[PDB]
Symmetry: C2
């Protein structure tokens, strides 16, 4: 529905030895696509407890201002070449995407 913000998330595990930090240099490059300041991307490693770490290893939270950022990120050759390796460097790929409505912030509740 892309009501407001659009979110894409990937959860992965490594079997070769995912160099997340060397990959991080890619993200810095990947951010290159944020010239449109209408796109977002963050990174996370499972720095919690095995029971809360879901067991994976790291994920990427990509949020866009709207569908324009989504077609933009793909309209470049930097995501294709990177996506191919993103696999070669992963053991499993899981992704959840859904429409985010920055409104839940409701400090009011009906009786």
């Amino acid at each position: 529905m892309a009501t407001s913000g659009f979110k894409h998330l990937v959860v992965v595990k490594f079997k070769e030895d995912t160099k997340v930090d060397e990959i991080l240099k890619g993200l810095e490059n990947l951010v290159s696509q944020i010239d449109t300041v209408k796109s977002f991307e963050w990174g996370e490693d499972k720095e919690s407890h095995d029971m809360l770490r879901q067991g994976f290893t790291h994920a990427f939270s990509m949020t866009f201002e709207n569908k324009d950022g989504y077609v933009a990120f793909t309209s470049h050759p930097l995501h294709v070449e990177f996506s191919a390796a993103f696999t070669a460097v992963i053991d499993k790929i899981v992704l959840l995407d859904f429409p985010v409505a920055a409104v839940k912030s409701s400090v009011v509740a009906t009786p």
Copy 2:
């Protein structure tokens, strides 16, 4: 490490009939804890493709300004009573929590 923002996420599936919208009224109440404006919570339903929907059904993205929001949300009786039902109303519970550093936004890459 809680370097900057702290994220907690839950992925779940329903077997009884998770009324996410009636639950949403709870979130509006849950937001009540955001009087400290140092806490965050959003909601999402798998409105994508079975292959991208991960198959679950809905998740909650709770982010805090720092550890103070994390001890705050629990320092209230609204999360306990709600958490008990959060289960009674769920079929499976999965959660990933990790330190988020709002800095990845790097539009520069070394040669």
